Amino acid sequence: FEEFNGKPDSLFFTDGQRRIDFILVYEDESKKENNKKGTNEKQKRKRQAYESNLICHGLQLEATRSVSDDKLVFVKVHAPWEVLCTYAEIMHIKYILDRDSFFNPATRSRIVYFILSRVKYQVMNNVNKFGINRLVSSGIYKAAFPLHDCRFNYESEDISCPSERYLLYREWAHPRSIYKKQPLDLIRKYYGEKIGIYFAWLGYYTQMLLLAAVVGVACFLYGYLDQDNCTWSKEVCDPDIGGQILMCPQCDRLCPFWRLNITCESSKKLCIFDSFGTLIFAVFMGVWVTLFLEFWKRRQAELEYEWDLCASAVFFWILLIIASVIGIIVYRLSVFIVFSTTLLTPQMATSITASIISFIIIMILNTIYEKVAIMITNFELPRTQTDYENSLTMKMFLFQFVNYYSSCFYIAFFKGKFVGYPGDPVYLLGKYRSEECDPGGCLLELTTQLTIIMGGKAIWNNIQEVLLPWVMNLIGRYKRVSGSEKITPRWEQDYHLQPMGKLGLFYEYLEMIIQFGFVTLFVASFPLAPLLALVNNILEIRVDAWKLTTQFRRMVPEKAQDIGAWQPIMQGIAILAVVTNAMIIAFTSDMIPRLVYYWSFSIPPYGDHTYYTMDGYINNTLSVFNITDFKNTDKENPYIGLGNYTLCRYRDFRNPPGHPQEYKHNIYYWHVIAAKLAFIIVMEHIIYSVKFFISYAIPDVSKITKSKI
Amino acid sequence: PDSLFFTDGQRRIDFILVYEDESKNEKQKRKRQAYESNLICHGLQLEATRSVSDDKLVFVKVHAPWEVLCTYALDRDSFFNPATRSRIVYFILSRVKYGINRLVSSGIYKAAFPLHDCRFNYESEDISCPSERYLLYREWAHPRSIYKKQPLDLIRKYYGEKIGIYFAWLGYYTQMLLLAAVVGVACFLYGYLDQDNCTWSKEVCDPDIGGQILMCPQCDRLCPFWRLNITCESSKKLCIFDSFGTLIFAVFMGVWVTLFLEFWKRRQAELEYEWDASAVFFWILLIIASVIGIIVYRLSVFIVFSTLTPQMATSITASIISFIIIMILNTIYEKVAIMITNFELPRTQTDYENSLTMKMFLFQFVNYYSSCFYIAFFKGKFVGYPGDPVYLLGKYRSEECDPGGCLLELTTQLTIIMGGKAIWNNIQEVLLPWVMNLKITPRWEQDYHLQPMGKLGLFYEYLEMIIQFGFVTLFVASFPLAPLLALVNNILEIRVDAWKLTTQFRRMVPEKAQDIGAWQPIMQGIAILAVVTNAMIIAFTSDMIPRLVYYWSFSIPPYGDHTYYTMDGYINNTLSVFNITDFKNTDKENPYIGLGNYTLCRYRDFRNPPGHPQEYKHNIYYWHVIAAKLAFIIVMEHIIYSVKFFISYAIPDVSKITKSKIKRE
Numbered sequence A: 001f002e003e004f005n006g007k008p009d010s011l012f013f014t015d016g017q018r019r020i021d022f023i024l025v026y027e028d029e030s031k032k033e034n035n036k037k038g039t040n041e042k043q044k045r046k047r048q049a050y051e052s053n054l055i056c057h058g059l060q061l062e063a064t065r066s067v068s069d070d071k072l073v074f075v076k077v078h079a080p081w082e083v084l085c086t087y088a089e090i091m092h093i094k095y096i097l098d099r100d101s102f103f104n105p106a107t108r109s110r111i112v113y114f115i116l117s118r119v120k121y122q123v124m125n126n127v128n129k130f131g132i133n134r135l136v137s138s139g140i141y142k143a144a145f146p147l148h149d150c151r152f153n154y155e156s157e158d159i160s161c162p163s164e165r166y167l168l169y170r171e172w173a174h175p176r177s178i179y180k181k182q183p184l185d186l187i188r189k190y191y192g193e194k195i196g197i198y199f200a201w202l203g204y205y206t207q208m209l210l211l212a213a214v215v216g217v218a219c220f221l222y223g224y225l226d227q228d229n230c231t232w233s234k235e236v237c238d239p240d241i242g243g244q245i246l247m248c249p250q251c252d253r254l255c256p257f258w259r260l261n262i263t264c265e266s267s268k269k270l271c272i273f274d275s276f277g278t279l280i281f282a283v284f285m286g287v288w289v290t291l292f293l294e295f296w297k298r299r300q301a302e303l304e305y306e307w308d309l310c311a312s313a314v315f316f317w318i319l320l321i322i323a324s325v326i327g328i329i330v331y332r333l334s335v336f337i338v339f340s341t342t343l344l345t346p347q348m349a350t351s352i353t354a355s356i357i358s359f360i361i362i363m364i365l366n367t368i369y370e371k372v373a374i375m376i377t378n379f380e381l382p383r384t385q386t387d388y389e390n391s392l393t394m395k396m397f398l399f400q401f402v403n404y405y406s407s408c409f410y411i412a413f414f415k416g417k418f419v420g421y422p423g424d425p426v427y428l429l430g431k432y433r434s435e436e437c438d439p440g441g442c443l444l445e446l447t448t449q450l451t452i453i454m455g456g457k458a459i460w461n462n463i464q465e466v467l468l469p470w471v472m473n474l475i476g477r478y479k480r481v482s483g484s485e486k487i488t489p490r491w492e493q494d495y496h497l498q499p500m501g502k503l504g505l506f507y508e509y510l511e512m513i514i515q516f517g518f519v520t521l522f523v524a525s526f527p528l529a530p531l532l533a534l535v536n537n538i539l540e541i542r543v544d545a546w547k548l549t550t551q552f553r554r555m556v557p558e559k560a561q562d563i564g565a566w567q568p569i570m571q572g573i574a575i576l577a578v579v580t581n582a583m584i585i586a587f588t589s590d591m592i593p594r595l596v597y598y599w600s601f602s603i604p605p606y607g608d609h610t611y612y613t614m615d616g617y618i619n620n621t622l623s624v625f626n627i628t629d630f631k632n633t634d635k636e637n638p639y640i641g642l643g644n645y646t647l648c649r650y651r652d653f654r655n656p657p658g659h660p661q662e663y664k665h666n667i668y669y670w671h672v673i674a675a676k677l678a679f680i681i682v683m684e685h686i687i688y689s690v691k692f693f694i695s696y697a698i699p700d701v702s703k704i705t706k707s708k709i
Numbered sequence B: 001p002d003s004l005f006f007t008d009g010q011r012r013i014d015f016i017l018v019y020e021d022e023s024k025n026e027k028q029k030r031k032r033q034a035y036e037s038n039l040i041c042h043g044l045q046l047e048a049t050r051s052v053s054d055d056k057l058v059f060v061k062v063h064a065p066w067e068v069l070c071t072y073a074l075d076r077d078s079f080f081n082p083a084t085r086s087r088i089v090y091f092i093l094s095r096v097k098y099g100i101n102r103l104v105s106s107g108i109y110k111a112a113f114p115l116h117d118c119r120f121n122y123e124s125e126d127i128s129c130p131s132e133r134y135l136l137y138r139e140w141a142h143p144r145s146i147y148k149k150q151p152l153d154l155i156r157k158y159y160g161e162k163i164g165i166y167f168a169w170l171g172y173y174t175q176m177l178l179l180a181a182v183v184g185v186a187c188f189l190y191g192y193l194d195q196d197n198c199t200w201s202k203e204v205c206d207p208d209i210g211g212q213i214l215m216c217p218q219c220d221r222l223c224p225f226w227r228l229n230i231t232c233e234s235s236k237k238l239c240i241f242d243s244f245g246t247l248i249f250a251v252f253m254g255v256w257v258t259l260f261l262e263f264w265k266r267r268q269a270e271l272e273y274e275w276d277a278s279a280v281f282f283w284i285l286l287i288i289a290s291v292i293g294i295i296v297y298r299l300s301v302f303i304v305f306s307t308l309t310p311q312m313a314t315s316i317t318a319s320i321i322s323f324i325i326i327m328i329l330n331t332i333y334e335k336v337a338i339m340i341t342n343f344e345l346p347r348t349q350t351d352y353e354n355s356l357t358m359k360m361f362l363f364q365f366v367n368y369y370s371s372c373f374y375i376a377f378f379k380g381k382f383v384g385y386p387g388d389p390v391y392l393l394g395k396y397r398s399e400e401c402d403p404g405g406c407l408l409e410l411t412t413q414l415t416i417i418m419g420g421k422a423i424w425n426n427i428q429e430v431l432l433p434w435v436m437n438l439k440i441t442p443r444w445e446q447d448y449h450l451q452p453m454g455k456l457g458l459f460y461e462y463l464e465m466i467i468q469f470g471f472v473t474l475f476v477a478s479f480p481l482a483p484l485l486a487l488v489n490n491i492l493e494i495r496v497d498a499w500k501l502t503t504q505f506r507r508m509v510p511e512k513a514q515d516i517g518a519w520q521p522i523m524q525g526i527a528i529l530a531v532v533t534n535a536m537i538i539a540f541t542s543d544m545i546p547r548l549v550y551y552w553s554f555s556i557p558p559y560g561d562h563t564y565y566t567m568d569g570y571i572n573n574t575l576s577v578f579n580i581t582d583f584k585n586t587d588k589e590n591p592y593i594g595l596g597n598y599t600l601c602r603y604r605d606f607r608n609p610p611g612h613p614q615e616y617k618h619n620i621y622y623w624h625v626i627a628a629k630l631a632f633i634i635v636m637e638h639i640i641y642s643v644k645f646f647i648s649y650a651i652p653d654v655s656k657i658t659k660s661k662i663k664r665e
């Protein structure tokens, strides 16, 4: 029941003394009512009842019609001394100058939101209805939000106003300040503890990632600068050793005989990514995770001081299993179709294309999995909102984990690991030939599937992050092409911003946790992952700040001293990382066979060399299969007509033709597997013991906090 | 006349202050005068009574006027319990400084203690007396009440919360040991009924197999070629403790530990809700203690041997000597731990207790388990072929086990140590009078005639219980009957501890505690170590993996001759061969020379035979077995840990009733 005063950036009522805390917006009742008048009148009486109750509770309200549309009506709110102080006393809110000194607008909005949520408006049939969500869900209220100080780009016209949003845009947001340390105190003052904790966690995470990236770059540099000493690569590239070894066709009819020379580039890359530096980096990451968690616990203190039925479970657990089942299948089919369409290196282009296709399908399935998780959680009746979001966390994390990680787990553990000798190929259930890796293995394949997935996730998420709000706002503006182009107040143009749905930072935390999973689980195959994480986080801080400050309405401040249900997830991933890295190094990498050959099979008893040497590894490790020993009566003529050669070599430790044991696993195979298992056990035990010692030694609480009290 | 109260006066005792008069130098008289004047002026009543037995030993009592005690903090004396009154008065006395403990230590007071209600043997003469002590003794302490339930509430009301929680923990441990023991005996019986189907033991007794296998001197110079069939009775005994029943029992104990921890946490939660530098030096001592234990065990077995029935008697006597020397070393270990923790000078008493208990537990742990760990893992696991035996130090040969293994005699050592310790300790504390069985003075004088605990009795009881738990959970694969032994031990321990506390020990000041103490972390550490210890025990100490590998792989035409899977020929197709002409690659003195026409012998190892290109080298079977062992360890550890975590997550840790109370309250 008021008109626009004339000042566009006003943060006060028309009088200029009462501060606006919340804006209530609803559609005018004079519109062209359709369907039934009953619903319109009921929602009406509900809105007058709620407003009358709010005024009775002691809140001043003023409204004014929209300057552009005749139907939009905005209703304002205010909280004087008495009610504010009374509610501060009631809710245990823990040198007074003025209103804008000790009751900051964030706390004022929090108190007003509490009052508006706790107020009742109507009781019928002896049932009590209350909660602001019901008003919006029933269509009574279009929205309800507080106001920003001013525009992000230009300073506030009010001289008294601090224009905090301008400071956030200049210093914190905007890529101009890509280097300055973010002012977490200002974030807490302006957005609340929920945002400040998230951004402090992001900053600390990216710092620890910088440390990890420095160490990983050191290890990668050690691997790269030491190349001429990687003897097996020289043997593979040598046309007198590698070129004379006739590898054995991997598939049945689409594969000719091939020589081991062609894989020289892949051998060099493996030498880079399969050195002892990678093992040292895995060992270091083992303690790095513990240091990260413990020092985050310490920071989580200074920050608290400084800033005060099972049917749906089994079903959802079965929805995560079928998701994993379809992920592996889609990866395999993408690889197969890319290979069939095959006409720098052709084996580097095929891998890149297959990984790109798989990443595209995973990104497509992400949204479907999100919707399925929402549907499953809604079926269950949450006890409270906290349990709702906790269940959503536990389901979405598993779904996302099973996506990309079931994508990589296959390459690591079930790619060419249970395939027999050519005489008796292993078929899963018929004509399902089990493909196997090159003599080098699928370490490089996994490293390529991992880097493409990480980069694609980062880039696509960031582009979606900054664009979807932008395009939404642009089209919303396009809906009012009428040439108004005039001065307008703050509230109506804040209503044009996005609502910033109830989930909040759920998606940001989810993406950061998935990135943590990539960087911590498979670090035994890609030491450069922490650098990717560092770059991604450096961009993400500014991306999130910009999107929150420019293309989203002001969240009602809520406060929490912990990030939430993600911390148990971080602990679980920390526990699983050691096992995953141990298995990766044991099986996905050929380090253990190389060490075994160097120490026990390059000597006169086994090899022919006087002293330990790494020479002869390739020739003495590869096996032999006779062409005419192909069993099975079906498909006798895959390639028997060629007859160009007679013996083919394959990547497996089996006895040669002749011998009492034709093609059974030999002593070398059992030595290698025993060494692998001993390595796994020793690494796991040492890493866990060191982690326990480090956790026990550190006080787990800040020293200065103890000093002050 | 055995009166609890003042002479012809209504006032209830809380403590007694005794001293010896200087009449039988005057510094003690002046100290006593100053202390008495300060106490009297402080606002507490006192009365002096000369001991009937000796006039020199003058006893002085105190009281607690209600106004003073209330100010410092149906009937007036029924609102507070006597235990609470005694605790309040003790706190008041501690708050004053001349430190009652300092006066006691400096001779100012001979003792300071509260009083019991009445004699345990006879009921209180006073009809008004509740006679709580007599009823408590008859129904809970005397062994005739062994099978009655434990009145926890009464016990806490009389003594305090510490005693109540200790006894509740002991009772619940016994209750869970009931299930552990029934499952263990079920597994043992299952193994026992399968003696006839134990193929390899029957092969060992079968002379056509056992007697035709000439083993090579297991010892040095002495022990000439010994046939194998002489130990098939030992093999028969071993076949019971080496069956799948032990594996099943270990798997079951893996989850039983989790149940014990989780439900014990629920018990704690319910009880809490219902009621209102020099470190390197210590580690060196630990290392030397472990080495000393190993050395003494080795020397004991050496002296026993160098002098069915023979080997069993030698093992038993070696176990007794090891147990005796361990018990002897225990006193020195306690003394040194106390001294070294005293040199640290902790500021308070709680930190002193924690430091003492951690070091005490570590010393006991090494002293008791060093022999077991050596005889399980480091015995007969790195001795090479007889041609080049391993002398790691020089002239100190490493002993080796029989073809079956050292598991049976490891179980002998465990059974001897556990049982001997318990029985010995029991009799030492208080079981002499009962077997042997099978004027008037005031109450304060009677209590003064008695002796107190010493501030470490509860710590010792907890220590012995934790060591028993360690024996039960760590080496459970070897000895599945350990839980039954623990069950009986605790069944007697509850009653014996109650009896000694109620009869031979002075009344203690009550205290509260929110948990048993620093012992729970010991329990989680013990469980985490026990899982891996059992994994390695089953993998290495027991020959269950070699025989499974033989059954599944080497009874098949590619490596064997049997038409289908079977254990036939395991003994003869697993033992290695040694040629005497290769006596010593070192060209040194050999004992094999001569001794008849014998030219070859067999030994416990999976090496290649003479004449093979890689003769006397580990063969394919050895590597197969090692891979199987490592894989079994990995699988067992991972599955056990996953199951434990799943159970921990599944259990909400609450009775589901706390939420109802929250809603109502």
Ligand SMILES: O=C(Nc1ccc([N+](=O)[O-])cc1Cl)c1cc(Cl)ccc1O
Pocket (backbone or CB within 6 Å): A269, A270, A273, A444, A447, A448, A451, A528
């Ligand atoms: O990600 C890869 N390489 C890479 C990534 C980053 C840097 N760098 O210096 O920033 C340098 C390199 Cl060679 C990569 C490596 C291999 Cl073997 C195969 C495919 C790849 O796509």
Ligand SMILES: *[C@@H]1O[C@H](CO)[C@@H](O)[C@H](O)[C@H]1NC(C)=O
Pocket (backbone or CB within 6 Å): B207, B208, B210, B211, B212, B227, B229, B230
């Ligand atoms: C072991 O076998 C030999 C001959 O085969 C024999 O005479 C001896 O009595 C056997 N041992 C036992 C305990 O029967």
Ligand SMILES: *[C@@H]1O[C@H](CO)[C@@H](O)[C@H](O)[C@H]1NC(C)=O
Pocket (backbone or CB within 6 Å): B572, B573
């Ligand atoms: C037992 O093993 C030896 C090892 O060469 C073999 O000669 C002998 O034949 C085996 N026993 C039987 C009954 O064949």
Ligand SMILES: *[C@@H]1O[C@H](CO)[C@@H](O)[C@H](O)[C@H]1NC(C)=O
Pocket (backbone or CB within 6 Å): B579, B580, B581, B582, B599, B600
């Ligand atoms: C043991 O080695 C000597 C070395 O010449 C050989 O003569 C003898 O035959 C071997 N023993 C057997 C049982 O073959």
Ligand SMILES: [Ca+2]
Pocket (backbone or CB within 6 Å): A457, A458, A461, A462, A511, A540
């Ligand atoms: Ca992102």
Ligand SMILES: [Ca+2]
Pocket (backbone or CB within 6 Å): B429, B461, B464, B493, B497
């Ligand atoms: Ca005892």
Ligand SMILES: [Ca+2]
Pocket (backbone or CB within 6 Å): B262, B647, B648, B649, B650, B651, B652, B653
């Ligand atoms: Ca639990």
